[PDB]
């Protein structure tokens, strides 16, 4: 039940998508960049709040931020 918002400064590196294990980020076409790509966060219900993605973002400041919030079974990474 975490929140994942991506901002206007994305450049279509795809390093955020390759990093986050839980497949919570995918690439969508867009007209704003040279690469003509942008990220997205359709399924944040599966977000474990690891925050690996933010590390991948190579911009001056993060175009992808994971604002932690209410917890859940999927978010707490509980096998039980």
């Amino acid at each position: 039940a975490h929140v994942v918002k991506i901002y206007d400064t994305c450049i279509g590196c795809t390093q955020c998508v390759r990093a986050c294990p839980l497949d919570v980020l995918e690439m969508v076409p867009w007209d704003g960049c040279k690469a003509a790509q942008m990220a997205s966060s359709p399924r944040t219900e599966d977000c474990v709040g690891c925050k690996r993605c933010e590390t991948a973002c190579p911009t001056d400041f993060l175009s992808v931020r994971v604002y932690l919030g209410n917890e859940s079974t999927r978010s707490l990474g509980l096998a039980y």
Partner: protein
């Protein structure tokens, strides 16, 4: 993909003696995950929970309690052996859900069908202060 592949719950599993990292009471009650892939030969691979196991030529199937345990294995197979796995989510009611290649193409490659979600059309920062939203939830949305 062209069409979602339905689950074949009766396929041969790898040759693995067993371990203690398996499934717990949560699996029967709440949900569990299963992963499928197709190998060309008999090989050895590291399991996320436990030790080593031997794949089987043809389809293979595992059961896990977490999505990270499954995707951890996809990254190993896609890199080491260069395969194309696909995994589902099974609830206690018997319902099945097809998760990771939901469009058939992996998320790190674009596709025309996809639609953006949680996309702010502004720069990081450049957003209202919390005082403006002091009595309801959210400064980022």
């Amino acid at each position: 993909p062209w069409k979602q592949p339905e689950l074949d719950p009766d396929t041969p599993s790898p040759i693995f003696g067993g371990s203690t990292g398996g499934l717990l009471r949560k699996a029967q009650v709440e949900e569990f995950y299963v992963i499928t892939w197709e190998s060309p030969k008999e090989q050895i691979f590291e399991m996320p929970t436990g030790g080593a196991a031997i794949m089987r030529k043809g389809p293979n199937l595992l059961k896990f309690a977490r999505k990270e345990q499954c995707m951890a294995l996809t990254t190993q197979l896609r890199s080491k052996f260069r395969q194309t796995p696909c995994f589902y989510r099974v609830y206690a009611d018997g319902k099945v859900q097809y998760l990771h290649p939901k469009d058939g193409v992996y998320p790190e490659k674009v596709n025309a069908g996809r639609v953006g979600v949680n996309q702010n059309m502004r720069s990081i920062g450049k957003n209202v202060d919390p005082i403006k939203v002091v009595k309801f939830t959210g400064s980022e949305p």
